[PDB]
Structure formats: structure tokens, C-alpha cells
Amino acid sequence: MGAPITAYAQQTRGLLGCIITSLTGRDKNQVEGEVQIVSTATQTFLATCINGVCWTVYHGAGTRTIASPKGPVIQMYTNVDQDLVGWPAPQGSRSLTPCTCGSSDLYLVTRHADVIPVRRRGDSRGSLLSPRPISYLKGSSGGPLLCPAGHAVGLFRAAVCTRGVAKAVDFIPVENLETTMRS
Amino acid sequence: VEGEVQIVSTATQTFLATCINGVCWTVYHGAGTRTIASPKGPVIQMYTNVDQDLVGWPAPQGSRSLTPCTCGSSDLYLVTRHADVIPVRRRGDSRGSLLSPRPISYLKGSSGGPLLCPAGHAVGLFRAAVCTRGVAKAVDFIPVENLETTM
Amino acid sequence: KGSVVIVGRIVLSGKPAIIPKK
Amino acid sequence: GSVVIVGRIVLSGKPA
Numbered sequence A: 001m002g003a004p005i006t007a008y009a010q011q012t013r014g015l016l017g018c019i020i021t022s023l024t025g026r027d028k029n030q031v032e033g034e035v036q037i038v039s040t041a042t043q044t045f046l047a048t049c050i051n052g053v054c055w056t057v058y059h060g061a062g063t064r065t066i067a068s069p070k071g072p073v074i075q076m077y078t079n080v081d082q083d084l085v086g087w088p089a090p091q092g093s094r095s096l097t098p099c100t101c102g103s104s105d106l107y108l109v110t111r112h113a114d115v116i117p118v119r120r121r122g123d124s125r126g127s128l129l130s131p132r133p134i135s136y137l138k139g140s141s142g143g144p145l146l147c148p149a150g151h152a153v154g155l156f157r158a159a160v161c162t163r164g165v166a167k168a169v170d171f172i173p174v175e176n177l178e179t180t181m182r183s
Numbered sequence B: 001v002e003g004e005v006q007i008v009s010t011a012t013q014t015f016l017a018t019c020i021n022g023v024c025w026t027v028y029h030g031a032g033t034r035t036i037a038s039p040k041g042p043v044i045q046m047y048t049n050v051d052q053d054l055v056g057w058p059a060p061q062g063s064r065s066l067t068p069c070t071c072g073s074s075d076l077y078l079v080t081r082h083a084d085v086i087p088v089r090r091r092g093d094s095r096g097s098l099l100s101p102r103p104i105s106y107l108k109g110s111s112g113g114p115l116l117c118p119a120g121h122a123v124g125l126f127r128a129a130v131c132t133r134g135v136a137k138a139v140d141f142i143p144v145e146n147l148e149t150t151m
Numbered sequence C: 001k002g003s004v005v006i007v008g009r010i011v012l013s014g015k016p017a018i019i020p021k022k
Numbered sequence D: 001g002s003v004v005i006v007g008r009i010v011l012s013g014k015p016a
């Protein structure tokens, strides 16, 4: 990967095609990118492909199957406690690689394809250098937090809000991903 | 698609502009007080700062704005008029050194271009290259704050 | 329950590019 | 004169 981290988004389907696809569980669409904007019939969020696996937040995907060209695909991993789930990365996607530098300077990629700076304050916390309204981060759960090199340091899970403005973010560090696989 | 960086020309020369906070900024040494073309006629500069070598008109059509950097990183990246990205280490407020010096020919026509941080956020606007013997070893730039202040 | 459906993508691998005049 | 826009650059590389 490289820097500066720049990202863009593309919508691939709408509400009706999404509902149909959700039921049939068969999606014939072409897949590209490291992060997929994903949706159930109740909510929409993100899923990040790290090392051949498409990871996302359990509180979003539950135990559901991901719709694929060959019909539904069951999850490879499920960890209610760590709030993780993973499916084999879709055919066409590009995976990110875990961070191996321990940089405290993280960058969150939102569902709007905006990358916002986050200062790591702990294993699963980092503070937004420029806080934003929580409505801005809605739908970004499952999205990546990269180090200056563009490597996955963790997955966005929850926001730390005060009066509707998020000051910090709660994430799932890649270590939990490794652990969830060994489990 | 919408672009953040516009490639402009004045007959005299050609350089770049960068939309930050809805304003299309570029170098005074390129545009001067010139207006920018529009399908409805010439549009005038919203800001002109001869002192800072900074001029800005309202962001044009087919453009999208860059966000100022708020992470402080010293690891900058310059985007040229050819879309080439060049890693630059921040030496100070308006100076940064190329990690791999290039002949000035490579940095030509890029004034006005953005000086991005690791997050693709604007740090400054490429003002002019600082070179030794035809080799651009570093660059001069206008920090975003100057722009945020000019507004 | 239904399947989680991919409704869009976010591409980090893109690099600065001069938008094609098309 | 007037400054004309001869082209555009998209930092993310967004195609089309």
C-alpha cells in the first residue's frame, strides 16, 4: 500500500435490487476495492477485506450469510464477544495487510470515502483530532483504521459521543482478527 | 468525477489550482489578479494576496474541495501537474525537502498544486520549487492556515 | 434472516489521475 | 486575459 491515503466510493445497487439480492442471496455484480459498503435489510455499514477475508462488525452482520455469485456464503469466522465476523473475501476484492509499525497516527476511512485522523490512545481507542457529529460516522462500522502506510490497524466499531458529537472512536485491533482465526 | 486539482493556463504559462474550503486557490505569480473563465463569463478572485503569493476564486464546476490537514504529520506528498506524487519531508512552516530530489523539469507547471499529508488532506499549496543546479531538492509552500486565515 | 448484500465499494488503491476528457 | 481550466486531477483516482 502507499500514502497519501486517498479513497473514493461507488454505489453498486439500490434499495430494491438490494432487497431482492438479500432474499435470493445471489449477487452477480463485479466486486472491486478493499472496503465494501454493505447492507442488511435493517442497516448499512462497512466490511473491510484484510488478508483474503472480508471482515465486518458482528453487531451489523449478525450471523447472516453474504450474498455471492454462487448464492449465500456462510461466515468463516464469528466472534460475538470480539464483535467480529468474516466471510471469504469476494472474488475481485483487494485485501489490506495488518500494520507492522505501531504508529499512533491512525486514519479512519468513512463510508463517504473520507479519511479522518485518529490519535491512538489505547488498544481499542483513538481520539478524533477534529471531532465530527455522530451522524457523520453512522454507517461506517466495519470500516478500516490505517497507519500512515495504509495498513489495517483495526476496524471501526463504536463512537464515543458527548452531545451528538464524537470525540473518540472505539475499534477492533487486527490482533483480535488474528485471534478470532486461531479460535 | 469531480477533481480537487485544476490544471490552468494564462497564455503566458500553465500551472495548477487547488480547491480547499470551496475556494479554488493558486499562485499570484501565475494568475496575478486575472479572473477565471466560466460558462457565464469571467469570475473574479474572491481573495488576492500578493504578499502570500496567494489568490483564490470561488471553486469552479467539476471540482470538489480538499480538507485542511488537522493531524500535524510532517510526511507530506506533492501532486504534480501530471498526477505524479512526490514524497516531501516537512522542514518548517513553508519548507519541505523532497525525499528523492528531481530535476526541476519534473516539478515544472505544478505551482498551485496541493501539498498533502498521509490522509490526503491539504497541508499547503506548492508555491515554488527550491532547487540547486537544476535539481529540485526541496519546495516552498503556503500552509493551509494562511488560506484559512485569508478567508 | 436475509443475506448481507454489497451495495457499493470504497477504493483505497486509487492514485491521483488526470480525469479523462470523455 | 483570464485563467482557463485546461484539465482536472482527481486525487483518489476515481475512474470515469
Ligand SMILES: *[C@@](=O)([C]([C][C][C])[N]C(=O)[C]([C][C]([C])[C])[N]C(=O)[C]([C]/[C]=[C]/[C][C]([C])[C])[C]([C])[C])C(=O)[N][C]C(=O)[N][C](C([O])=O)C1=[C][C]=[C][C]=[C]1
Binding pocket: A042, A043, A044, A045, A057, A059, A060, A134, A135, A137, A138, A139, A140, A141, A142, A157, A158, A159, A160, A161, A170
Ligand atoms: C456502526 O455499527 C456504528 C457507528 C455509529 C457511530 N456503531 C454502533 O452503532 C455502535 C454499536 C455498539 C458498539 C454495539 N454504537 C455506538 O457507536 C454508540 C455509542 C456506543 C459507544 C460504546 C463505546 C464507548 C465502546 C453510538 C451512540 C451510536 C454503524 O455505522 N452501524 C450501521 C448504521 O449506523 N447504519 C445506519 C442505518 O440506519 O442504516 C446509517 C447508515 C448510513 C447513514 C446513516 C445511518
Ligand SMILES: [Zn+2]
Binding pocket: A098, A099, A100, A101, A102, A103, A147, A148, A149, A151
Ligand atoms: Zn503500519
Ligand SMILES: [Zn+2]
Binding pocket: A117, B068, B069, B070, B071, B072, B073, B117, B118, B119, B121
Ligand atoms: Zn493530516
